[PDB]
């Protein structure tokens with residue numbers, strides 16, 4: 086199905102987003118055609134769950150489901166925090182460029198959160214999740230954003246463009262928030278997606 090909403094973990098570590106800005110700029114100074122493929126300043130996030138919310142009532146149900154999700158996250162994390170190290174560059178078949186999530190224990194925890202989120206939302210009546218295996222990633226560019234590239238002289242991201250960063254430590258993000266975001270509504274003034282609702286993770290209540 087085609088989703089229109091998603092749960093999003095914003096990247097709150099300014100070092101990570103600043104380092105990705107450098108990476109995007111390094112790429113653009115080599116080929117300015119890639120400008121419209123870059124994700125916008127302020128939009129950096131990890132997608133946790135996609136879904137359809139197709140009317141105002143369903144948007145309100147989604148907000149309720151996210152509120153319900155909060156305690157499950159802290160159960161999964163066992164009263165500690167989830168540290169996400171962002172290191173190196175990966176792609177999905179040269180069409181989407183992302184900063185990779187380093188391997189480690191936090192990957193299984195993040196996967197458990199995604200699966201519990203899917204279950205939580207489905208039990209509230211929301212079509213959510215994907216059949217495809219969840220592959221967490223922090224996108225910096227996607228060719229699909231720039232449909233004239235395909236039609237023109239650029240059909241994949243040349244790996245030479247990001248070679249200097251292929252193995253760069255961007256930084257570590259501690260999970261602090263999950264937002265319910267609209268894919269299609271206008272972005273906030275700070276460049277982030279329209280947010281219906283948000284919960285805090287990892288803080289004293």
Ligand SMILES: Nc1ncnc2c1ncn2[C@@H]1O[C@H](COP(=O)(O)O)[C@@H](O)[C@H]1O
Nearest residue numbers: 131132177181217218219220223224227
């Ligand atoms: N497991 C996957 N395999 C291939 N492409 C993916 C996968 N997960 C996400 N994508 C694509 O990566 C693009 C950017 O991801 P995102 O920044 O999370 O929206 C999305 O349009 C997804 O369709």
